[PDB]
Amino acid sequence: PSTNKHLKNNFNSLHNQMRKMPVSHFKEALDVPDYSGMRQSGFFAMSQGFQLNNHGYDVFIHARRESPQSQGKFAGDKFHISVLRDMVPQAFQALSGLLFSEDSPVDKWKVTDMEKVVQQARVSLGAQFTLYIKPDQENSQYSASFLHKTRQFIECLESRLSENGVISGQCPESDVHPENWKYLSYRNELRSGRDGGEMQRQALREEPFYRLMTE
């Protein structure tokens, strides 16, 4: 059973299992680079077990856990965080403790390097952070506990940004999000494109992963 099919077949059950779990705690990493430090990554740097680099092919600074915590194969689920462009450094500082946390469910993420930007309004005026999520089990299926941890993490990011006074940016038309998410948005890259549209958004709202994160 594919990752997506497994979620679809067990939706209500997973949904009910998640509802009984306790608050997820994320120990915040203190010795972490600030936005400027991230840009200093170059060809290689390490921090809190995350390999860092910003050497060149794209407009982002990359972060990947050396010892991954999710053993399944990537199934396309990813999030974006949109804030005012000039607030990216502040937003990064507000979220670094969580992004580098030894308890974070995100093994891989990226943030736009504002100095490398050309005319990519999509990831500069919005969607400046990208979070990759992958099934935790070796069999590539999501466990209810991991889904809960992931939803709790995303809600933690939302709380942290609001608590720091960050203002939302331009949400990518390729993504979908409930009214209560002011900065976060979602899309599955295996079943959607970076080019938004009402058709795509209506299709994304039925993704079982998205439904488990919002309903």
Q: Please check whether residue 101 lies inside any domain of the structure.
A: yes
What distance separates the 2 farthest-apart alpha carbons in the chain?
46
Domain holding 205, by residue range, is 1-18+41-215
Instruction: Output the domain CATH number for residue 85.
Output: 3.30.2430.10
Annotated catalytic residue within 6, 62, 110, 134 = 110
Q: Please check whether residue 35 lies inside any domain of the structure.
A: no
Q: Would you call 6 a catalytic residue per the annotation?
A: no
What's the N-to-C CA distance of the chain in angstroms?
23
Q: In what order do the strands lie in the sheet with 108-112?
A: 45-47, 50-53, 60-65, 108-112, 129-132, 77-81, 184-188
Asked whether 91 and 164 are in contact (CB, 8 A), the reply is yes
Q: Please check whether residue 62 lies inside any domain of the structure.
A: yes
Q: Would you call 20 a catalytic residue per the annotation?
A: no
Q: Please check whether residue 157 lies inside any domain of the structure.
A: yes
Q: Which two tokens stand for residue 64?
A: 């990947």
DSSP 163: H
The CA dihedral of 207, 4, 76, 19, to the nearest 10 degrees, is 70
Question: Distance between CA atoms of 146 and 142, rounded to whole angstroms?
Answer: 7
Q: Please check whether residue 52 lies inside any domain of the structure.
A: yes
CA-closest candidate to residue 133, choices 70, 66, 204, 52: 70
Q: Please check whether residue 33 lies inside any domain of the structure.
A: no
Annotated catalytic residue within 6, 62, 80, 149 = 80
Q: Please check whether residue 27 lies inside any domain of the structure.
A: no
Amino acid letter, residue 17: Q
Q: Please check whether residue 29 lies inside any domain of the structure.
A: no
Q: How many domains does the chain have?
A: 1
Resolution of the experimental structure, in angstroms: 1.8
Question: Distance between CA atoms of 72 and 70, rounded to whole angstroms?
Answer: 6
Question: Distance between CA atoms of 3 and 75, rounded to whole angstroms?
Answer: 7
